[PDB]
Design a protein around this ligand. Sequence first.
Ligand SMILES: OC[C@H]1O[C@H](O)[C@@H](O)[C@@H](O)[C@@H]1O
Ligand SMILES: OC[C@H]1O[C@H](O)[C@@H](O)[C@@H](O)[C@@H]1O
Ligand SMILES: [Ca+2]
Ligand SMILES: [Ca+2]
Ligand SMILES: [Ca+2]
Ligand SMILES: [Ca+2]
Lengths: 111, 111
Amino acid sequence: KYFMSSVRRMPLNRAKALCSELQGTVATPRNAEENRAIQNVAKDVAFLGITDQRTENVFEDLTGNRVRYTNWNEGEPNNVGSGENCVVLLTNGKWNDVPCSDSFLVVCEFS
Amino acid sequence: KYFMSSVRRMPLNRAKALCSELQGTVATPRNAEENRAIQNVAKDVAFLGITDQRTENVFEDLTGNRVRYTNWNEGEPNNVGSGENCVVLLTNGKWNDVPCSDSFLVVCEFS
Ligand SMILES: OC[C@H]1O[C@H](O)[C@@H](O)[C@@H](O)[C@@H]1O
Ligand SMILES: OC[C@H]1O[C@H](O)[C@@H](O)[C@@H](O)[C@@H]1O
Ligand SMILES: [Ca+2]
Ligand SMILES: [Ca+2]
Ligand SMILES: [Ca+2]
Ligand SMILES: [Ca+2]
């Protein structure tokens, strides 16, 4: 598993398209080791390939698989405002749910 | 080095922008092993990070470094017509010089 970070920020839709353009996907950490590896390649807050768009508070990867390992920031996920269904990795390595329409860096995953 | 191929076709400047978006570069094989590795990921004709834009018939990688290893297809490079200053990897692994404004898949290189 190889991880690469984007340089510019963009909404999840464009982020997914970017990783997919090179036949990869948006990074989804499966354990603390991968979480750290992704954190290190990202120089700022970045999207992860996790969302609860299909069912609220049910987080799954971009292929529909529910995630087991999670690393939520204290107080998260809180689905604030009109809703937050996407997930970003903070620069401390913890996760925060955010609006999928907002712009952040993206870390892509390749195998 | 890790090599990944794009899904869509685009001209060289767009190809460079794509690879650089993930902090990579357009694949430049330095030997036959890497050439075959790029072959493994390219399902169709793809751009390589090589051009003779500075001086005709003097090929350099995208950072202006003159390359040594080459794997030109028989009869190439021939700089046909108004000029061919970019390079693509044919599906047989050999190279052809083409117009930088023409569209092809791109193979990006990461380390
Ligand atoms: O205070 C935490 C809160 O801050 C902002 O409102 C957003 O980043 C939310 O996603 C987050 O939950
Ligand atoms: O037949 C060889 C010739 O075919 C086409 O004209 C182009 O692909 C050229 O770049 C190539 O040299
Ligand atoms: Ca939500
Ligand atoms: Ca939140
Ligand atoms: Ca030329
Ligand atoms: Ca040619």
